[PDB]
Each structure stands twice: as structure tokens, then as C-alpha cells.
């Protein structure tokens, strides 16, 4: 099902709320040990991981270097080794088991650093950093390659995207998106990299566009109904779900669904409560 961990509405949240569009409604599960927003969700071996973020509370604002797994049979969280640095507004992209932690911020410092960690040695090792410092970065994996998409460098919000070549441990700039997007929702559907919504420094976005690898072009697809940045995103059996986010005024509970074969974005259902900055994955 579609799980969402963390988020923010007045303070960082511990929530965990699996959803099933074939079930129709939601389900509440084990709370995160430490509240988190600006985190990323990913599944490795059915094991739902929660990476980086921060706890923005009435008594603090602690950037999280933590990594935490939730076995969905046992319903219990478990602390795994911590990253080299805290990463608020992180991106992550699963790659043959090993988890990739991308960019993010710690205080004033916008990372270009990247580090990996797999469920075996439970260690973090720094790899080549990105060409760009990126927080609010969207991350995707296509043909066993890692794409970092959009984000914010401290001063400029980005339309650029860059690709990590593991066998060479270097980053290469690719064709930029048509739109500057920080805090967008980025995922692979079919074999295109999708990039939905985000913020360009003036306005939240409802536009969506997708990247075709063979032609290296970013085609503009159907836009969503409600502009949103800091949204969750995931693909559930060949369709796209965006959950929550911020539109400059409101913390959204709206969940829209994109149907590719018709190119239409419909609002299937909403969340139990509006929130931004969640981690989303599927297992």
C-alpha cells in the first residue's frame, strides 16, 4: 500500500498512514520515534526506510542525520546507522538495495554531498558530490542510474538535473527541465522521470513534465488541479499519487491521481489532515 511517514502541520509529525485506493480509505500505524518533516521515504526488501528531515517543534528545530526502518509485519521502527551529516529536505533513490541520500540542508549549509547505505554492513560512505548544492531535490532512478532533479542551492531555485554514474562515481549534467522546481514531487512512471509541482521562488506550481531518456527531452504533461510544493509522491501499480504539500497558504490534505493513458489528474481522496514535507513509499 501507499505509506506516508512524517510531515508538518504546525510542528513536525510522527504520523504513519498507509492508504490503498483499492481499499478506499486509510489506516493508522506505528508512530515514528522522532517527529520528522522534510524527509524521504523508500522501501528496500519490503523494509520501509525513513531518511533525514528535521524535528521542527515548539522547543527546537533539529536537522536529522537519522535513518529508521519500519517492518510492516512487526509494526515496529528500528534505528539504523546515521548519515555523515543531517539532511533536511533530502532526496533519496533506491539503487540495487543500497540507499542513496542526496543533498539536503544542515542549518545554513546546502549539501552537494551524497552518501549511500545498504542493509548489510549498515555503513555510510561518501561518494562524489553533485555538481550543484541541492535541497528540496527530487530523486529518481532509471536504468540503474541516479537522477537528482531541481531543488535549491541557497540562492537559486533550479531547473537543472544531473545524473550519477555509479560505475564511474561522477555526476553529469543533463538537459534542464522546462520549469524551475524546488520541493517538487519526482518519480519514475513508465520509463519517464516525472516532476510535479514545486516552487519556483514566486509561486507554487501545478504543472507537471516528464523526461524521456532516449530523446533527452522534457515533455510537458497534464497539470494537477492544485498547486503544491513539499508534496509526497509515489507510483502505485502504474499510476501517480501526490499527497499533501503547501500552496503558499494552506497545508493540503488533497491527494490527486494522474492517469497516464488519459493524461488526466483526478483527486482520488484526501489525507486525514493537511501536511507538507512527508516521506512516501510503497510496500
Amino acid at each position: 500500500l501507499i505509506y506516508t511517514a512524517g510531515g508538518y502541520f504546525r510542528q513536525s509529525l510522527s504520523y504513519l498512514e498507509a492508504y490503498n485506493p483499492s481499499d478506499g480509505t486509510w489506516l493508522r500505524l506505528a508512530d515514528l520515534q522522532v517527529p520528522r518533516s522534510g524527509l524521504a521515504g523508500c522501501v528496500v526488501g519490503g523494509l520501509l526506510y525513513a531518511v533525514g528531515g528535521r524535528n521542527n517543534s515548539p522547543d527546537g528545530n533539529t536537522d536529522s542525520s537519522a535513518l529508521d526502518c519500519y517492518n510492516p509485519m512487526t509494526n515496529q521502527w528500528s534505528p539504523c546507522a546515521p548519515m555523515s551529516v543531517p539532511r533536511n529536505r533530502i532526496g533519496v533513490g533506491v539503487i540495487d538495495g543500497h540507499i542513496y541520500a542526496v543533498g539536503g540542508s544542515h542549518g545554513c549549509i546546502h549539501h552537494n554531498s551524497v552518501e549511500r547505505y545498504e542493509p548489510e554492513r549498515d555503513e555510510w560512505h561518501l561518494v562524489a558530490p553533485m555538481l550543484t548544492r541541492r535541497i528540496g531535490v527530487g530523486v529518481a532512478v532509471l536504468n540503474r542510474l541516479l537522477y537528482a532533479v531541481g531543488g535549491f542551492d541557497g540562492t537559486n531555485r533550479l531547473n537543472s538535473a544531473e545524473c550519477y554514474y555509479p560505475e564511474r562515481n561522477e555526476w553529469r549534467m543533463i538537459t534542464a527541465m522546462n520549469t524551475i522546481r524546488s520541493g517538487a514531487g519526482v518519480c519514475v512512471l513508465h520509463n519517464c522521470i516525472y516532476a510535479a509541482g514545486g516552487y519556483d521562488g514566486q509561486d507554487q506550481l501545478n504543472s507537471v513534465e516528464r523526461y524521456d531518456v532516449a530523446t533527452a527531452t522534457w515533455t510537458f504533461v497534464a497539470p494537477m488541479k492544485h498547486r503544491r510544493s513539499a508534496l509526497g509522491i509515489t507510483v502505485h501499480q502504474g499510476r501517480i499519487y501526490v499527497l499533501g504539500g503547501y500552496d503558499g497558504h494552506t497545508f493540503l490534505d488533497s491527494v490527486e491521481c494522474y492517469d497516464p493513458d488519459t493524461d488526466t489528474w483526478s483527486e482520488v481522496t484526501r489525507m486525514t489532515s493537511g501536511r507538507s514535507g512527508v516521506g512516501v513509499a510503497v510496500t
Binding site: 529536505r89 510544493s229 503547501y246 507538507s276
Partner: peptide
């Protein structure tokens, strides 16, 4: 509130 995430400073 953060223009992008809405979170407080």
C-alpha cells in the same frame, strides 16, 4: 512561514 514548505522559522 517558509514560502516553500510552510514550516515555521
Amino acid at each position: 512561514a517558509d514560502e516553500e514548505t510552510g514550516e515555521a522559522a
